[model samples]
Target: RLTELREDIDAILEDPALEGAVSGVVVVDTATGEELYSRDGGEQLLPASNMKLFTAAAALEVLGADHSFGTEVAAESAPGRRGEVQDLYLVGRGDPTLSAEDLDAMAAEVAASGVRTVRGDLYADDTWFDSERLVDDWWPEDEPYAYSAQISALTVAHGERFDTGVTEVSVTPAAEGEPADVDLGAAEGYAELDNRAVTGAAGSANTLVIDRPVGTNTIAVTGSLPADAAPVTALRTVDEPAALAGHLFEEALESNGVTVKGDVGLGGVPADWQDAEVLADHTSAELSEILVPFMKFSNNGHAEMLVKSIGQETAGAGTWDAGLVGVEEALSGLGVDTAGLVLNDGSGLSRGNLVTADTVVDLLGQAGSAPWAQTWSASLPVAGESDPFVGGTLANRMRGTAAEGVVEAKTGTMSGVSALSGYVPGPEGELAFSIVNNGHSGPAPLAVQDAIAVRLAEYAGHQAPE
Candidate 1:
């Protein structure tokens, strides 16, 4: 089955989709470290979302699986003699799962602390990470999407999936001649609205378009919405998510019977606020739990946050530069060769990331024996599983096939990049494989990659094909 497997892989690579493309392919038996197949395994290629594989593993190692990031409301000290503080600081230390309810809870605690009002401006402190939002090589046109959201230490997650640095804008139609109503979820007044759309005839085609004009905090609603149509919601990125979080927290303070006399804005804590009183605080779910939504949906925001978090944990700095260095060091300690990897961003959205299929398989092998292996393994999307939570990105793929419920892997796809790397189990043993395709002249080479994965699932260590 050994040489047979190689021929099968060779034939799979011969697909028209891989024509003139550079693909890095490698497979090995995990139980005995037997090399089953290798094709340009050493060549480097863009990993797309597959970069999360390394980011998640490194985060678990550097930040500890049980680690929890924090957010808090603090003041220079307790309320003054009159039960009032001049300033209240909303400090976030990179909690990707922090929600609006958490802020409300914190606000209630602030009220309980005898704080009546903020005589000074309420500041949102995001000093934990540098001010850089998007990575250097990230395309500007992609900035408005949730996947390309601006990364900040203090950003509000949208829903159960924990997508951060964005707000959901829901647009509803009104009378035929009336303007459409727009509601910004989570960011009500935090994101400015520019509604130029009018309701159309009851059965008219809905041409409604919701967009955030580049380099601004405005949500521009244009086009006409059919009067009889249902409300539509779109998740769009916001400018300076820290400011947005502060805005939400400010409203929370008011709703909880606490008032901020000053407007909300962005700034850092005072140098001498060493005696600051933490009125309330929130700790996110442990890294192990956070990894589920992060890896399952290939959340770019979470990946970047973890990278900055890693930088903070390992080097006391929270920039991507520091975080990537920490990731590299952690991977090297895990026996993953760093020479074959070049990380630009944790999410792999940046075309700058480069990795060899051999390196990915190396990581898969080393990760299996790590202390946090179980948590790391469980984070990968399970192929053929129907449940979104269980199957994640793979829930609808490879179902009813030999690879269904048997392959656990991370998938990556972008323009010319497609990658699948993970573990597949068979009666003989577990196999680790990596496939990365770059510069495909045809469409995305997903089929070619899946064929390889399915083939491995079929012949894993059989030493001969059926």
Candidate 2:
């Protein structure tokens, strides 16, 4: 009897909705680790952002839940008097959580560090990760979106910083006879904010699609730009992650009793400016939460830094390729079976990432039994819920209801992929099992994946407690 329903699920393989799509699915008994249902579960489908699950779990296990990535700031060259440091260096160690408040704190730290006065340039050392803007295989148009930003140790909100905080003018073609005075405020490198205050001749051009290619040196505003408007300009640059790291570094120095008198720049500390007297380290607690956000959010910059830092700190190789190799090894140590995975980039930003349903399901099932299980699960999104779509899962799923609170899972999506993997409370109510899908088609793959989840959550009678 149990086998019958299991087969029906695998039969979803023929689901009309799954036609012409690359996908995998699997379900297991959380209590017994028994495979309940599966189809194409071993195929290596593109995991998209769903790959963040693996990245998150592995990071938490290896880096710990309370570890923090850090930025080091110091005077590269103290001139022997107040305002003496000829140049200040903000050395980035790939800490993705560096924020404005943190930066401000570091500045205060520098001020309190006893000698303040910078007469030299501020240098940003982003040598941690390889500087390839985006994966060679990432879609060019995705760059404008915050998630498509270059991975930087010093990025703010993953490179989302709006300029002016007010829309200057609507880029969407102005109304046939109206003024195009919609302000886009300041450009935040992360979220895509549109000047909703503008109007167009037919409302067709009122709203437009802006394209920021992933690897471009500057923010490429595609879709629309003002004609009579002044020449457009980008408020932020994604070209150098190290520069962000450098800014954080300067902040860190000030926080640690070091002051500088120079401007900040990008590059390694010159041999002439290297200071052997002051060295700084990160606090374990802060580092831990930073890792959580990086993993929970599947932060590409942090993932990139994980690899870069691994290479530089452990392997002595400052390249992502080497860093990824280290990540694979680390994941394996956490009991993840990496057989059918091709981890192209740390954040799964590369279209080259291919993972099997069984691989993900297996990892999720196992992580549910581990110590970091709760923390890991909290990072996933629930279905049929949350703002934008709200009330299903994610932001506000179910905590109490008949079939409510029965599942904890991570959701994955991209142009052509959809997936879900995490703990689904068994008939006996234990966190176990998993489901994953890939290569979805149709106009609304995300909705389809959610619907599939709702069906799974309602599953019962195949076998009850006992």
Candidate 3:
């Protein structure tokens, strides 16, 4: 049985397009924990954003589902009759799940605190996180790109939607003969987006770049989006986080019938800083869901925030370095071999993160059998099952079935690597599999991976290829 399955998977790997791909596959019966198929499953291929699945699952397990990231709003001192009041502080404890809605709610909460106008400055306290904006090894040109938003103690979507009235268009690949599909969501204002996406020949090279007009709301895309590509949105950009936080606080206070006269900016509260009045508190989303969008969409900022949040949660220290140590510790406790995993940033956007195929599969296998298995497994894309443009859309051809959900797993890709890891359910039972393609020469490795999955599915029910 194993030999036939191996032969079938090997045939798919022999495809012309997958000549040099490094892949791995592991099928196990969940009920009996029996290994059904294995193929170089130990070799590490760049897992890309897929690594977030572990990050998110681990965070959720430790933090609990009901936990929410809290943003603190406090007054440095009491208000005086002379209008010379103390500074008002807005602090982030490394909560990436904080959204525009949460900010607005936080603002409203501040408003209800009885200060109509601030008599001092509004301070953005982000001391919980480090000051490094981008990883040293990240692609320089990709710095301005949304994914490159500097990791912050209090970054929301990597500060993609900081300013109001700003919009962005993301052009991704599409299916064959299909003009890339576009999805429009609520923006601060109207936006004109031009998408230049086209599906390339199978295994052909491709690129996607969003061209923002100078000082305008129009976005001109100048690259090809693949078939079943995800549409772009105008992620809020907080150019001046201090100012934005101030505004949010002001709006919140005003809505709550409070008055304040203050300016908001960045700084840490002194240990001896005077205290005046306590205002409303802001609670963020559960780390799991937040990590979903982060991993599925490969949001670097969110992933980084998750790391920092870990630091804060474990030792009340919100720093990436500390968080890295915490993650390693957590994985060690989970019985994972951490020697092969290299991480420069929480998100796989940087190539600094090195992990092996066995590591990813083992993580999944262990997690899948735990109480949080559903949480971990559900965070990934279902190949042809879910929205193609969103997450890792694996649709059409072999492995695309609702019941089968082609790749009910996470997909990752960058310049030279393509990888997918998760559960592949077969007729015999559920299979824990991992496929990694390092340094590929095609637009994507999905086609090759899908072909392999198709063959593996067949082996699931009947005898493997002879």
Candidate 4:
């Protein structure tokens, strides 16, 4: 049955669309750790976002599932008779989950402490990690996109939602022949908006364009909006994440009746700065809970944060170089062959990241039996599920098929690279598999990958592939 299944899957890979494209596949019985099939499985291919699987697993192993990132507010001195502190500090421990609302809460805590004013600057102490805001070797032009948002120990999102480092903008027609109204969701003064969008005829085509130029925070909106059409919304990443976070925190301070005499800016917390009072702090959800959104959405920011955090935990240095070393150790300890694997970044956003299908399958098998396996597996995007955090990237895929609501996998996508690796229950037992396709300068190879997963879902021990 296993032999026939391999042949049936191999036949699908022979499609002309896959010709000249680099591809690999490996499937194994999860319970027995037995390889059921392999096709160029040892060749290292661009893993894309599939690299998150390794990042997620290593984070769980090294940091533990219950680990939580801490963001703190410290002051050089306690409030005096005038309700003033000499200096204020916002310390970040790589909590990617930090939000504008959370900052507000911290400010409220400061206000409750009877601190009416900060006589000194509001320093953003993001020194918890290195100053390498962007990963080396990432596509330079992709900087403006939210997916490639800058990494910072201190950062802020527009709201208490996904920390993608971007805010939503909604454009709606005001009236016939009038300019459309623009709403920068949760982003006030975060970016300059040049609205060139005008309301057109009721049946006119919606030709709206929203873009933020590279290295600029100016979001220019061009084109027309039909008066009868619905509002158009888009997300844009901020220019400087740490400064933005500081500014937001400053606003929150004022809103909570705490006045700042000095400006808000970026700076490291003094090493000897101690005897300071802890005003307020925000602790993130456990690493286990964080994996759900991190893996489901393949958040580049979260992946990088976990990497820096791993470095901080093991080497006392929050850096990619050190963090990746920790990741290699963790994965290597799990029996994954790191000799041929190259992980340039925690997220597979870098084209330099490479891994063999067999390596991913082996890692998946090991993760399935780890102490935190339940949390790790639950974080995977479930096929045919609708919930964003639950189904995630696979929400709409494999619906009405045998794989629906069955297969749990991590998805990867780049221009010419696509990958799916995870587990699906079968008659024999659970099956762990990995398939990665690369080098095609055409449409994504999602269909081919999906077809293979569907076939795997129909697996009934000792039978031909359906």
Cα-based TM-score, every candidate = 0.96, 0.76, 0.77, 0.95
Tens digits of per-residue lDDT, candidate 1, 92-133, equal 999999999999999999999888888889999999999999
Tens-place lDDT digits, model 4, residues 315-360? 9989999999999999988777788789889999998899999899
Q: How far is candidate 3 from the true structure (C-alpha RMSD, Å)?
A: 7.8
Give the 10-residue window scoring lowest on summed lDDT in candidate 2: 160-169
Residue by residue across 103-183, what tens digits does model 3's lDDT show? 667667665444456666677777877666566787765543566555666543324323221224434456675656544
Ranking by lDDT: 1, 4, 3, 2
Stretches of model 1 off by over 4 angstroms after superposition: 461-466
**Worst ten in a row by lDDT for model 3:** 158-167
Best by TM-score: 1
Clashes of each: 2, 65, 52, 0
Q: Residue 330 lDDT in model 1?
A: 96
Backbone clash pairs in model 1 (N, Cα, C under 3 Å; residues 3+ apart or in different chains), count: 2
lDDT of 2 by residue, 295-335 (tens): 44445556665666665554776576776777677678767
Residue 148 accuracy (lDDT) in model 3: 58
* Model 4 RMSD vs true structure: 2.3
Best-fitting candidate, scored by lDDT:
1
Better of 2 and 3 by TM-score: 3
Candidate 1 has a TM-score of 0.96
Once fitted onto the true fold, the runs of candidate 2 whose alpha carbons sit more than 4 angstroms away are 1-4, 7-14, 77-80, 158-237, 244-264, 271-288, 295-298, 310-314, 384-393, 396-404, 426-434, 460-466
